[PDB]
Design a protein around this nucleic acid. Structure first.
Lengths: 97, 110, 83, 98, 4, 97, 110, 83, 98, 4
DNA sequence: ATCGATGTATATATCTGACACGTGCCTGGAGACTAGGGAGTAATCCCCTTGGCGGTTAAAACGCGGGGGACAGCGCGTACGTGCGTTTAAGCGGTGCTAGAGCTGTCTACGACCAATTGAGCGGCCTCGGCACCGGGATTCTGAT
DNA sequence: ATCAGAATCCCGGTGCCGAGGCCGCTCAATTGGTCGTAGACAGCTCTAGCACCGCTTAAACGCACGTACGCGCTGTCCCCCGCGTTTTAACCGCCAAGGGGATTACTCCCTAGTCTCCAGGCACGTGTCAGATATATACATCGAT
């Protein structure tokens, strides 16, 4: 019997990698670091978005809590770009419904 | 019949999985409710930060004339960028090593 | 089985190599016993928490995830072993 | 016979070990140390091989970072030799309360 | 500079 | 109209104070610090108990998650005495329940 | 018919409010479910730690010949106890000040 | 309208008093401008976060809770102002 | 006339300000500093009185703790006088500076 | 000793 | 400068096992739909924020004199680095086995939901005594003689 | 040692406004019950952790040498302290206007939940070429002269 199905971001990191550097590969150990990074940053943002909802007595985490969490957690110009990317994606998604 | 299924990632124009991110937000005990735009915004941010690191790490790999990113190249990428170094200031990257850095007083006198 | 005095297995040339990576040019002979004491305190704090995660899971084997969670508790997040 | 002067090989060693990513402690001595410490918290523990490697990566990274802070303390005292008082200062200013 |  | 109710631990801090020091009082600023302390320690323990349940794929925070969170968060003797106090209370409760 | 209500705090022998602690666990998005023993155990721990600080702060008040605990006495209690100082190392207590502490090299030579 | 040069309102004698509470006996004349730079950087980090919490609440007034949350996020938990 | 020797009154000042708990920066100058910094992040902000007092408590507690670490750095260099290099070392070993 |  | 020897970086050829990819499956994401209550928002109250002024006097700013601390030089001696001949045990590989991690199936003890009822504890009100202030005397440090 | 001066400490007294107690009410904790599913737990299996042997040789060890670094001392210079005078503006008590924080009521838009597919993502197997080893030697640079 095959081993239990364990999810990873590995395929998405690779799909992003081949946009950024189509001729570059990645080692299995480096991919494990990248999977750890994505999980870490996810938990930081989701954790801060959770507190924002709590401090404002909201039941709901929305894109607005995510945007504010990003502005809290990411430094400097890294925050400016991430907020832009997040706003662009939500705009496109809303136009596509 | 129902329309042919499109991933929410495709509607968002994202590589990262909006549907999985939405499930993880719902299952992770972050709030009673998760709004529909929250996983789209979060997936876009996670994708952007992934692309930012991989670009710098792919440059470092190319500077070492190597085709594969290895943990060393991720460490060089993060530690040489002021903002990623600040984001990852308390993170240890296994098998990353350290930046080459010798204090000037330790170098031999001419 | 019982183990004793294995802290001396952290030998002088091993500590010296770590100091070299730390950029240290010249090392006082008293550093080696100082460094061993520092390392032993660090490992006690991490392993105590990792064993606590192990016992709560009712496991007998310390897993790499138990170490990773213990380090994250210390504020010393480790990438590359899962999580 | 040929000799390098004091500190010439030390600098040459610094360049080598900052270039490498290898783990610098011997694995079996470190593994016995981990087991001897764990033995105080619970008897007859087992360890995943990756659990010991995670501890070693974390421990060496911690010590290397402390030596960087220790070197800055020594240089602040206008020394080049690191001394225990420098480790104690670095740890105290870190809030490890040495 | 900072990526897209 | 009267103001909306704002709950605090102040009355229970005072009840505990009158056990340890019957003749001693507390200023309202010190009570505000004590209320902040109780909220901080609650949030720390419940937060670690939450992660413990998650790491072990449990839906329920039980007294066993609380006991482990206390052993993670409190320093040595504080942990041992807190674990004793918590265990005694749960033992008494389940006998009177 | 219905029995007279007896609080869970009194069943546990606690001053701290088991019923409110239970509500705060349920509302806090900590887990899908909260077991019946969790708020009893947590309330007993919060009560214990409260008593630990207040006892030391009450002693500091007597040493200062004060009847009433003020933030200074809380600071003196926390920082003079090694374990509470470790528990509260990153906490700032408003109006607490600092411990009296002069480095020996600064004292005048006799 | 706009405020200017208020960092010089952190007076030399005020910095001395803070150094005295820090147990400092003798103070170089260059410490005062160094200290002002440090304080300004510290306040910028806290206030930037506190304003971020204020704008998320759609409030125009920075509340003490916004400061307390800003400090808590930065690992500098403050007791005595609520929370 | 009577004169105290250098450092005698400095020690009395240390003893005094370590007994007291009041805030040591003038409140109105600090409040104007807070408002000046805030105006870069948002125009026409208002502040609760307690919000400014929370900032001042946090700021003075931060600076006092930094001066303790700075004093240890100066004493490590066998100096009595703290200097900017002592602040910069304390900030770097804390990880506040890079 | 620690409190009760 | 010069030599020369040490050791590091650059080329080339062999090899291999790690990753890049393809396939088969199934699990979990997507499509369509309903129910209902979280959040938007509009209208209102009135808290508390900003702002301005006039007095006082605490604190800041300034100048100055000179004490003692910073720090640049120098001397010396012993602690450390460099080297190498000897010893240790780490590392590799192979093998054997069984502890226990991981999984599946079944049950029921437990916790979530619910409605009815009550009193815990909250807001507000008032009182008085713990602490703030202060003026006078005690005494203890400081430093100069 | 002794003495005069400054400073801090201690005491008795006045008084005020914050802490403690009380009231009364309202909403959140209790009681009693049902439901259904989380997880206790028993049984199984096959991963991988542990123990062991034994060979090779990388690394650790220990001992010699000497040099360059630590640090102890001294001398000089000027920066900081202490403190007396003048100036500033902090503080604070008061008055005023108002902005906007903090509620309400309403209601609709959004998300949770359900069922039904069905294709994205995983575990697995395979092939090959990027990187690791090895040998050679061109080039750097160290340091004795």
């Amino acid at each position: 019997r095959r081993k239990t199905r364990k999810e990873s971001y590995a395929i998405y990191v690779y799909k992003v990698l081949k946009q950024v550097h189509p001729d570059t590969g990645i080692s299995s150990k480096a991919m494990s670091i990248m999977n750890s990074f994505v999980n870490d940053v996810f938990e930081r943002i989701a954790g801060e978005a959770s507190r924002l909802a709590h401090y404002n007595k909201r039941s709901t985490i929305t894109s607005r809590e995510i945007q504010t969490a990003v502005r809290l957690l990411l430094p400097g110009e890294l925050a400016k770009h991430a907020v832009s990317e997040g706003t662009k994606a939500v705009t496109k998604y809303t136009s596509a419904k | 019949t129902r329309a042919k299924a499109k991933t929410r990632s495709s509607r968002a124009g994202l590589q990262f999985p909006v549907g999985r991110v939405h499930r993880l937000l719902r299952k992770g005990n972050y709030a009673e409710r998760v709004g529909a735009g929250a996983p789209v915004y979060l997936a876009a941010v996670l994708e952007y930060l992934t692309a930012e690191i991989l670009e710098l790490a792919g440059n470092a790999a190319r500077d070492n004339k190597k085709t594969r990113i290895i943990p060393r190249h991720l460490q060089l990428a993060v530690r040489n960028d002021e903002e990623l170094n600040k984001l990852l200031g308390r993170v240890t990257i296994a098998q990353g090593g350290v930046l080459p850095n010798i204090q000037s007083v330790l170098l031999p006198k001419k | 089985k019982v183990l004793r005095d294995n802290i001396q297995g952290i030998t002088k040339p091993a500590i010296r190599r770590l100091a070299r990576r730390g950029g240290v040019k010249r090392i006082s002979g008293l550093i080696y016993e100082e460094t061993r004491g520092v390392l032993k305190v660090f490992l006690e704090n991490v392993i105590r928490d990792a064993v606590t995660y192990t016992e709560h899971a009712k496991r007998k084997t310390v897993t790499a995830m138990d170490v990773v969670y213990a380090l994250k508790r210390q504020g010393r997040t480790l990438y590359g072993f899962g999580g | 016979p040929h000799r390098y002067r004091p500190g010439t090989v030390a600098l040459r060693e610094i360049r080598r070990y900052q270039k490498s990513t290898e783990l610098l402690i011997r694995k079996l001595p470190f593994q016995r140390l981990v087991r001897e410490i764990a033995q105080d918290f619970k008897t007859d523990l087992r360890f995943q091989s990756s659990a010991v490697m995670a501890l070693q990566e974390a421990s060496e990274a911690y010590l290397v970072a402390l030596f960087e802070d220790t070197n800055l303390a020594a240089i602040h005292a206008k020394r080049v030799t690191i001394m225990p008082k420098d480790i104690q200062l670095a740890r105290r200013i870190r809030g490890e309360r040495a | 500079g900072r990526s897209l």
